[PDB]
Amino acid sequence: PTKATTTKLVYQIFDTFFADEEVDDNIPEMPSPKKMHQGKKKKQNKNRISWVGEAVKTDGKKSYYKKVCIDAETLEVGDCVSVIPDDSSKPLYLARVTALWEDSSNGQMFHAHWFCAGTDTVLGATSDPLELFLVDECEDMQLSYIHSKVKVIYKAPSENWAMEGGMDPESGKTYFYQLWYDQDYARFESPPKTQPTEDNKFKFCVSCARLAEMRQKEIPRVLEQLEDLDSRVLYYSATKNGILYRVGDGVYLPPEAFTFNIKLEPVDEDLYPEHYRKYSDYNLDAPEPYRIGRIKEIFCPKKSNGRPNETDIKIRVNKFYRPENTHKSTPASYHADINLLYWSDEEAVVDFKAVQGRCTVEYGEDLPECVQVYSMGGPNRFYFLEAYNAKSKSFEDPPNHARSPGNKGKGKGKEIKLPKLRTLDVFSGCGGLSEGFHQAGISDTLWAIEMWDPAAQAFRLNNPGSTVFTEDCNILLKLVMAGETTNSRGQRLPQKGDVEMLCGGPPCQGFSGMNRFNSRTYSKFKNSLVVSFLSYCDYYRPRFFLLENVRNFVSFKRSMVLKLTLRCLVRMGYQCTFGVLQAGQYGVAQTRRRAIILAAAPGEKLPLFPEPLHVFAPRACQLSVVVDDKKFVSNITRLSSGPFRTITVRDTMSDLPEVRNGASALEISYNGEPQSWFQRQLRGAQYQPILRDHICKDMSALVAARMRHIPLAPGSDWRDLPNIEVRLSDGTMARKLRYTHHDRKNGRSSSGALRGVCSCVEAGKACDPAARQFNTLIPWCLPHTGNRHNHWAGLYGRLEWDGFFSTTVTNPEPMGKQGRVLHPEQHRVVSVRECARSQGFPDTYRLFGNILDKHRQVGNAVPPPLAKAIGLEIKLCMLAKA
Amino acid sequence: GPLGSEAHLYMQVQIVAEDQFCGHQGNDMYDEEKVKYTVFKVLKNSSLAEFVQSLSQTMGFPQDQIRLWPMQARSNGTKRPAMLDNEADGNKTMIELSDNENPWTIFLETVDPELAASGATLPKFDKDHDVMLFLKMYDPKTRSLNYCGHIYTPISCKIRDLLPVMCDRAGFIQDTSLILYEEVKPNLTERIQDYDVSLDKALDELMDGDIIVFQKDDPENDNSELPTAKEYFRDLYHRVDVIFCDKTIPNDPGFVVTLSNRMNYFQVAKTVAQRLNTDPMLLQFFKSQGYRDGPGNPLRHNYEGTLRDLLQFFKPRQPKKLYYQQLKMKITDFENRRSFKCIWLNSQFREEEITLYPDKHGCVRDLLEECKKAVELGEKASGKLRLLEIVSYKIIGVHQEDELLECLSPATSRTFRIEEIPLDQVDIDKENEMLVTVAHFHKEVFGTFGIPFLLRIHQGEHFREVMKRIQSLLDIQEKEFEKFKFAIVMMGRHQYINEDEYEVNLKDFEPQPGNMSHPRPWLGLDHFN
Ligand SMILES: [Zn+2]
Ligand SMILES: [Zn+2]
């Protein structure tokens, strides 16, 4: 069982290399990477340089040739050359000759399209020393700089690439390349397809063409004008960043864009001896969601020579009110749909630069679809049914000029459905990832692998048309490579061509430390489930590949797990990338950062990362990754804002019936209506007589007493516990915590009472074992080790209705590390149903086993909303391949 | 049911006449539910001409005296008469003219038989330059629509020229000032501001079957609750008939109230309370199950949705029901009731499962009061109730009636029992008589069973009198009682008691001095079952 089943490729990768959130980032941030080929370089002394043949084309000052000769060695366009760095530094600049020309103004010249050293990518020392990567980085250069003509080949994927999995590398040593490389986003992709015309055929450079495309795409320009006035010029449509804005379309704006006309004790230290540990706790909240406006006018002011200034494109818009923007304020958001708005006759002018994207905002009644069908049918959809008057603080029917001019619906007078990807989910759990993917509409998970039996059972329950294997993944892969059709119990094994999508979350246990690999830990990682998973990838060759893990995956063993993973994927010939996502930004109230590794086959398009749907606390939204002193971000363009309001605990579980500590009832009545959009989504439109798995752990009488003595005020934890004698449910007596020592750091109470519970406060490192205290309402162990663990903030803490879950764990313990588990009002730990709600699980999603089993199943699961977002991002790529 | 060998070769052609347009108070021409058709089962391959012959002969008209205007659906969801050329399209199959639609509805335009006996015939219609407009008159005073027939008119005709027609078709004095709207669709009635413009310009996407609504321009209209046709069609768009039913009443047909889609909880509750002559707070509402007919989720008093939200999952065909029940307490107090499952012990010493709903903040007293309201007591007993707590078939305690209900956890092994106090336990001699906890057990004392109970104890009792008292309670077999092994249990130890020695006094039942906190000695019986 120790040795991991592997392919010769992967095994070689990890053999030829030979020689629990520690919150690796609160960041001394870096500008990062800094296009690399900037600066000077060493020129070469060449005795003879002459143009072979005659000029193929002559232009304004340049004269192009097909082939040149340097010191008796010929050199054509399309060849590759080596140039020497001015610094004594080792990297040897490599380029492709895209054009050769004589410029009487400047001299004998060529255009160098640079390669990137594999060791200068994210791969680092892991990279094949012979591997190069296409970049956008090119420059004109005098021929004299050329040191040598070097050979570079293109390792194109074979026409039989999808079956080359498991084949041995026997199938000399030169420079080669197979992938283009985005340096900011760390994206390895297939080489760009952009073709030359035949007029530039000789001088054609791909980097120049892509630079052209890009810089042309991102200059905002007005399109077709429709009215000229004395001070300004009006247009029907403007365009920016590839997206087109007509008059009447919806527009995203920063909260800074416009404003709405609406008018906007000492403690007893005897009774509360540990409250002082909160005074060091006395964090920016979640941002406002996008302002939403409707484009009324698109205009450019004249320069007052009488001609329009098109650098100064401006938009006049109608303001939309979110329910929380009205006089009813924040509580108006509780019941309302997240996409619900109100029309207003208020207007505002903003720069076209401030526009953060286009949205669809319709009047709900003119919709052919029902409102929710419309809401769930596309990415950026809002609707309104009424109009708000801030002056009268009232609501009325929308004006007629607000019902979009486009659909009258009379006449002239006088939906691409993709086949779902067959998906293999390794280390599936109860199947949250597969759930979200099923919701994306891209996958049918036909095979799953989970060693833990209850989770496997759950997956079976939620996916009856699939085959769940409980055997070790290694012996299964071994079975398949041995040409076996089935396992021992007769379950059909997946074969090459069956698996179209591979997804999973491999356990990192035992290499999960931050510091560098030794031979031991590397021996453990060498046979880890990560290598097994990558072996599954290499063998099956799916169109798409997802590896999800804890965030610190990108920082494990100083990012070597990540680097080796990426390197292996590249070796397979995959396009690949990595990133970090906060689940809270995608429709749940939780803080749950995940490391996401994406990969696509050569014939495919590499998926982007999902653009954040919901605003969220900035502290929980640090998505960037530092690898070998380079900062890597994802393609995500939304930093400070988002379309939708943040989801809260109130949104999550306010509709659930009040239960009590150790609630055992598996089937109970909801006893009410869904009170929120979120609840409406997770409960569905249809009546539900039975609510399942609303159940709580049964805490000891002591813990129950403590819990019921935690105040309801936001920010309450164990530090608000009164020190008092309590009569426990079992008849036991809870004695007051005695303070037997003077605490140096924390000093003395106003009363002059001692704050130490033990000798170890004097750094003497003794721990008088006779001084340990038991059965106290205020837990001795917390002031014991308080000073070293940030005063144990959050332990025995209550959730806030307006707040969010700390990362949903497998076994909520009030004294655990994640330990603010308590219900905002009732005295108990959160129920299984509530945790599932915090994970974005549909209430009809089935779990299995005893209560701890279900808690664990929920805890280890990927939040289905997140997986849904990623899944849609993949759906785009499925559509794009034509 | 059973199809037929060539039922698939036929199609329904539903003919509607203009008389069905009169009286319609809603949008478009007619109500689909209330309309009376003349139905034809016709071969799909039948020509238009054949159907015109058949129709003309069947309904009694000359073929040149009728015109067919197929009822055609628009994108907005409306359904209006469209143009059909009897000559040009006469040779086409009915199924291609219907565009595979079936049933296929057609408007039948004929000349008024009372104006045709006088010699008039069917007017000519130019497909390219003419249009057929339908005219409605809105009366604000009665808040109603009056169908004013249709007209053929050139597209280029001016709105101002249609006014005399509208006037004399509605019985208006000529040169009466009129407000004109186009009924574009439900919830879209658009006023015509300029009467000096042609029909083409005035009406975007001008088609045959378009509807112009008109009313008097008169200050009196502001006394109506629906002064304009716009507001009329708006209020009509949001109008809905709700059937309120009491969930307690079996097969309650319920009562129908006409309400608005926009109404909140407060307004609805007020309305129903009015038609029921009660305080709104004394009403609890239930959303419908909606696939099944029956009460669904209960509504909180603070429910922030509207009536439309409550009725949205009903089909437009379905009757829209809303459930409710009348309360004995104001709905907030009713929402603060605590579901408390416990066991009721009767006069017959038999256990029943009961669930009571005392106030969540109440005391044991309130629970006992509920249980007293729920049951009947013995012919004569105390009439006073009490609350026992039982675990492992053993009574682990009695709860004083002032104790808080929030301090009780009706858990798995924890069973709360309520029982009427026996007469000889109400008032006893405190330093003489003592109440002892009694339980059954088979073999050893860990395994326990049966119904535990509280027993009175005298002084120097003569133990078999106490056992004939026990026996007087139990009453199972008549000296199978004899096999009872009597024991005193304390901290797991047990000493059996000799039945004929009669050793009894309180001292053998209290714990050590000043002791309450840990379990008190109890009486044990052995006999199995
Ligand atoms: Zn270039
Ligand atoms: Zn210590």
Residue numbers in the entry:
A (entry chain A): 615 to 633, 702 to 853, 860 to 952, 962 to 979, 984 to 1115, 1133 to 1600
B (entry chain C): 555 to 1083
Quote the passages of the study that discuss this structure, keeping the authors' original sentences.
USP7 is the first identified and only known deubiquitinase that binds to and stabilizes DNMT1. To explore the molecular mechanism for USP7-mediated stabilization of DNMT1, we determined the crystal structure of human DNMT1 in complex with USP7. Structural and biochemical analyses reveal that the interaction is mainly mediated by the KG linker of DNMT1 and a previously uncharacterized acidic pocket that acts as a substrate-binding site near the C-terminus of USP7.
We next determined the crystal structure of DNMT1 (residues 600–1,600, designated as DNMT1 if not specified) in complex with TUDUSP7 at 2.9 Å resolution. In the complex structure, USP7 binds to the BAH2 domain (lemon) and target recognition domain (TRD) of DNMT1 (green) on two separate interfaces (Interface-1 and Interface-2). Superposition of the UBL4–5 domains from the two structures results in a separation of the respective UBL1–2 domains by as much as 40 Å. This analysis indicates that complex formation leads to a significant conformational change in TUDUSP7, which primarily occurs at the hinge regions flanking the UBL3 domain. Interface-1 primarily involves the KG linker of DNMT1 (residues 1,109–1,119, designated as KGDNMT1) and an acidic groove on the surface of UBL1–2USP7. Residue K1115DNMT1 binds to the carbonyl oxygen atoms of residues D684 and D762 of USP7. Taken together, the KGDNMT1 (especially residue K1111) and the acidic pocket of the TUDUSP7 on the Interface-1 are important for the interaction between DNMT1 and USP7. An acetylation mimic mutant (DNMT14KQ) or acetylation of four Lysine residues on the KG linker of DNMT1 led to a decrease in its binding affinity to USP7 and a decrease in its protein stability.
